[PDB]
Amino acid sequence: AKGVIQEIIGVVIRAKFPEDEVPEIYNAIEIPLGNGDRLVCEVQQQLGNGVVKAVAMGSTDGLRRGLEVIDTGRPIAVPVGPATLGRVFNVLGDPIDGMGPIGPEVERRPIHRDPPSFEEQNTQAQIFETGIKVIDLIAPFTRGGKTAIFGGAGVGKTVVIQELIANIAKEQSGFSVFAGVGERSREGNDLIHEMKEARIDENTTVFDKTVMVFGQMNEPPGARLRVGLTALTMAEYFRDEGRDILLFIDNIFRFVQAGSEVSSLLGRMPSQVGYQPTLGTEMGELQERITSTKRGSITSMQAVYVPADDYTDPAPATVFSHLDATISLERSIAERAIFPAVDPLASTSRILDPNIVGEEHYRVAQEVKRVLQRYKDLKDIIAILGMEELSDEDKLTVQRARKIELFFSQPFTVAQQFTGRPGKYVPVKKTVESFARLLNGEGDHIPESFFYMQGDFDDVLAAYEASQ
Amino acid sequence: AKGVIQEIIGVVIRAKFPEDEVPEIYNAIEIPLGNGDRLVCEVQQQLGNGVVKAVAMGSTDGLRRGLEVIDTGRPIAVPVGPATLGRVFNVLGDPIDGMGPIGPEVERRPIHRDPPSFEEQNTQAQIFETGIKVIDLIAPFTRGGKTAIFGGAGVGKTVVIQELIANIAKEQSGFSVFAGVGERSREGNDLIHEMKEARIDENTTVFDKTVMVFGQMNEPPGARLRVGLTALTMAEYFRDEGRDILLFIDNIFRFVQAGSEVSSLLGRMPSQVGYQPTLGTEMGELQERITSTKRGSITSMQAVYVPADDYTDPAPATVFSHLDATISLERSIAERAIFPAVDPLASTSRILDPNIVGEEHYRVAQEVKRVLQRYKDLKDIIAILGMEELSDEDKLTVQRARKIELFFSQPFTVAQQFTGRPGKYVPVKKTVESFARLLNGEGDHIPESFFYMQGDFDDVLAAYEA
Amino acid sequence: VNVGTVIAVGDGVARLSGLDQVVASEIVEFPPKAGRNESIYGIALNLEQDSVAAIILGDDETIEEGDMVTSTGRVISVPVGQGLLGRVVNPLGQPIDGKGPIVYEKTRPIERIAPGVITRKSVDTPVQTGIIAIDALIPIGRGQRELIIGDRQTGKTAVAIDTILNQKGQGMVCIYVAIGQRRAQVAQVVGTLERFGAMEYTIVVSATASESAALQYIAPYAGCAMGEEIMENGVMLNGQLVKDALIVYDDLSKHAVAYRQVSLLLRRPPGREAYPGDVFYLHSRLLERAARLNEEYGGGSLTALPVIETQANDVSAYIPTNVISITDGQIYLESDLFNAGQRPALNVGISVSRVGGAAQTRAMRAVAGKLKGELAQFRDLAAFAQFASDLDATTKAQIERGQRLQELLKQPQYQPLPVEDQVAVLYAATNNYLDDVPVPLITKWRDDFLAFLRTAHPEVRKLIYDNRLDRKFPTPEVKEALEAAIKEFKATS
Amino acid sequence: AQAEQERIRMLSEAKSQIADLVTLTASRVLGAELQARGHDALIAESLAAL
Amino acid sequence: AQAEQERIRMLSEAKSQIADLVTLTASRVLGAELQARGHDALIAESLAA
Amino acid sequence: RAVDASVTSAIELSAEQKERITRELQQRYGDVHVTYHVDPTLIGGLIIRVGDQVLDNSLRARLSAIQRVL
């Protein structure tokens, strides 16, 4: 203990310690900082002569060289238990809501824990109903399986997450954990608090069954880099005791970005597009803890930001292999006001198998992808020449493909402000029936304009009949 | 002063000086070359203990490490004043024409000056009446504003360059500056000397009314980088004298490329196409002393080579960030129109707004552009169908568009291959009313081919009378 | 009192050997020497061993090896308070308008962590931009971050300055941070603000294109610190304490370019598009400070209007997508619409406001929901309009109504409209009270109608303004009053 | 208006010169009066401060 | 000429010179004891301009 | 010892004044490596740069008055 700061490079603080009292790799060292409040840095690399490199996880823009550094001797420990339910925490586990601090009797666990072994993995999987047509048909979510929503900036990742929470966070049969890493502090939280305290399952709000860690974008890189692990530590306690956990992590991409910034400050050699050389390892360390084990299940539902509209960027590229169900949000589809914006061709799922999701569901989804493909192949032919040069069956499939594109649009309860239409909860069975009817030929006479922002096929038929 | 050369790597040297009296940045250290001549290097960085990294701005082939280095204590001195009018200089301010040296009595200002302060700027933008017909109407200049000219090896670029100097002398003070950044020794220096000296107005050569600065292709990147600032320094004397000055920079993109090469040689990391990281700041050091101040104003006209056809290229993008007007010389119209071949649809101007040039000028310009756009849209129909399928109320507009595209010809006081037509200087006040009347039905009688270099609507009526 | 010496003046970065007890973001002084009367400051950022690299806030041409420096004992900070109002200032807070020294009692540090999550509230109060299209289709609430993204000369600065002008009696303190803009443009903008009397409540922070890249990198943070001083403490404006501020960061693409220069000259690794890895963090830590604090934390707000310039209408670039992912909406200005005469060029299809739709006057939403619907109808039927009037009659009337609405949205520069005027005009346009008016005359019809209401019927405007907050705006009394006013105007016309 | 501005421009240089000259004369009064008031008695203040 | 007249009035010591010098001395050099040892005439003695 | 003082007073100092200055440095070591540059431009004080800390009592209040007045 009792080290001194040698260098201050960004949020990377180099501190020298006595030769026999150096901190371990992930210990949490503290600068007193005066005023009775401390700055908790996390060690990353043990250099020579008791020299260590630590990530500030804080402002670190008013502290000089030679300042005393205190080695806590243990990694960043965060509270776990029912005491964390209905509370809001920092990356450090310190509550930031108005309520009081977590008492000492509450168990504290390190945020750097080994992931579950291979023996502990849970292979069981079944469809998780979301009420969203395109998600429930093309890429069905798994109960206890990782899924992520990929998309650019303007596309609706956060609105999809908010509708998903409003849909499934009432019938939890367990607790849930939310982690908006590097997200807007406006919508990412304090607007989700409003809806999570407005929703009331049974004499208790959804917020009362939710642990919440933010580390929003305003924070420096270290907080965004370790907030994901803090949230996973919060959720793992409930998983281990058998409670089913819903895990929402926002923009895992900001976790990777904060890692990249910290690595750049750490002197590592950049990999690919300025990214950290330890990209895959950090990603795995975060994501292998997001697993449903035999003791309990975690139904993770992540969001991922792709730099601009780039899907070959290293961060989403590493995310794609860490998922059971993939969803891709396209800028082009969103610009067409088909706001759920999920690309059926770029979205897949592991449980889209007739043994699991059902034979009719699988047939309808595969046909809705075949038809969608035909349209992507004929896209240029339609673009320059026109629709009339196609054969009769190609023309019919193109019109049906456009109707399918319009039909994946769905109003959301949380998106009622943008589209005046009220939200529609479409069960997966009704989605399968609607798309089977659409492919069968029913609804061919209907103009494509009536498939926009509707529920099941019955609503489309009712709208057409009201229009005569 | 009195340092020694420590290291020579191409056109980047490192001179070691005493611990005190180190040269500042951009201090123009001078190396004697064993004769009357010398090598002037510009300090770009300070290193270690008294070591300064400088760009050669010369041959740097006869040098040896250990030669004496003399610190001048200021940026590259440039002669200024009427002594520079009618003379041709390189980046260092030495004359490269046949005449002798400038001499010691002439004022020498630092090449690296600050732009005019915030309080000196002109609050209100004023049109710089050029005298052209198409430009003074479609792409009006701005007094103290930057203007681009495109087209590469088009036609009418050079004649417009000389005509603007001729008109600026006729209307404004007249003094002009040509900054030949990366100017070819054959194509762009001797030929332009002959063109300027042969071009004469009111018994005065255009050469005598302009000062030319040439950073040649063969000179190292530093010379081509700082030749623009040398030209600015020469122009700012006359601006400070209250005169209106027109600064011509040939291929500002070559200034950008010289900056990129200097940054690459200095070891700086590249930026976004391999360009210099200091692209915005370098383009702001230049093109920000080009402003209209309370005392005087430096209007400018910068030829711009768009890399390939990518205008979004950092180089033309950062140039467009600093542009107030654009003139687009096009090859298709250049096939037959060797008079100013400005494409009226592709040439725009920021100042062409009702608030500044008035409501009448804006109305006339918009109507002319509308008619020409209608003709552009119907060009394919005319080529395919013919004049007969084209209905009524558009055949009139197509004929009017032919006549008005022909009426963007101007008889020049000074021209290449002088056609003999008397020079004419048409103000904006005349141009607006002339084109308004041409759009008001008058002039429908004279055939389209007799609009070659007419000049004014009163002259149109006079030509129709004969 | 603590000193060091410059050992190498690099690419805008001095090294400052031996300057211990300097904090990690201190502002060093470089006291004046012979040949330099004024002090030029720098930010000590890389506090490495036996060397403190410092970015020079100014031209590095003036400093030299062995020059003394004096740590000021303060993190990088700018003067703030009421004294900044009506002053064009440097990012350092030094005045550049020449009116005199800045009077201030306290200085707030730039580059702080934003207030947070709990210290916030959903925006409820509207920011009246004064543009019909923006105020009706992309509502902006106080504390919202609305990106004004476009393509070079499209009217982004025009929209921002129109917004700033409209906040005259609105109890708002405007801030305009010019980052990388030409000094001529900033001078013209300040002249526009002064001639319309909007300078009495406006602060201007100017880091022009010639200024060193160290400036233009702290300029938005200086402006945001001033805005935060307004947000938390507040200033007296028109005798009433205002804790709401509006900050126009202007071109943040130039801000990102300046930070790219600063990073690359510091030999930091480049990332995507050669930008540093933390350019997103730059813009995020900048913009997240623009918040709407709840009543417990003062109740103030700071509205941000960042401007991004796109290349060739490419909204899918790196920095534009970064700022879109940071901010709460987009006012997308199209170049095609701008050149086609729709001078307040606005891609209504993709311009949106995530938050602030609720922060609209109830009259405005009640009148403009169907306006958005009709504009959507027009944009849908524009594709089918390629046929020469082969569609049916009622949809032809819909297309004509959409054309009339589009002409109505067209609004001249430097002429903001009060909310009562805007809602009256949109009521007229949406009740089918303009279908007989020919398309080219609609702008003059609007101007004449507003002049009529200003002169003939002040009481109708007062009644509309007073009754703008109620749940059901089309009340019978105001409905019939406005009906009588418009019928009288149309009979007169 | 522009002539008033131009006159102020010349006055601005004159005003700056007058201010600098007045302050420099005030300083030189200390410099001239230093010999009579004491040439090297200023060390007392430094000892207390240091 | 107007600026010349104003500058002549200012250069006339009675306008501001002696007062400014005395104020600066009392503010900086000595606690209202600028004259200290001698300097009785030396004060503004060489204030030529 | 290793601290270095850099005293700069307007007029050249006599031996007794130099010894008084050295006694002034008894707070740190008494006799550190001290170098006396003259710098006649400064008036009425001495700039003691002991280590990396300076003490300014010479001419700089009047020059602050210049900075504010100009």
Ligand SMILES: Nc1ncnc2c1ncn2[C@@H]1O[C@H](COP(=O)(O)OP(=O)(O)OP(=O)(O)O)[C@@H](O)[C@H]1O
């Ligand atoms: N609503 C409007 N009505 C009329 N003219 C307008 C309007 N808005 C902008 N303009 C004109 O458009 C031109 C460009 O406007 P502005 O200065 O806002 O551009 P900008 O988008 O900020 O571009 P730049 O990147 O060059 O700063 C100017 O002539 C301005 O007068």
Ligand SMILES: Nc1ncnc2c1ncn2[C@@H]1O[C@H](COP(=O)(O)OP(=O)(O)O)[C@@H](O)[C@H]1O
């Ligand atoms: N169901 C929906 N209906 C209408 N608009 C939607 C819907 N979902 C998303 N959007 C649009 O998406 C935008 C918000 O996207 P967001 O979820 O914030 O993405 P990101 O978090 O990547 O910025 C809103 O402006 C809204 O217009």
Ligand SMILES: [Mg+2]
């Ligand atoms: Mg602008």
Ligand SMILES: [Mg+2]
């Ligand atoms: Mg939203």
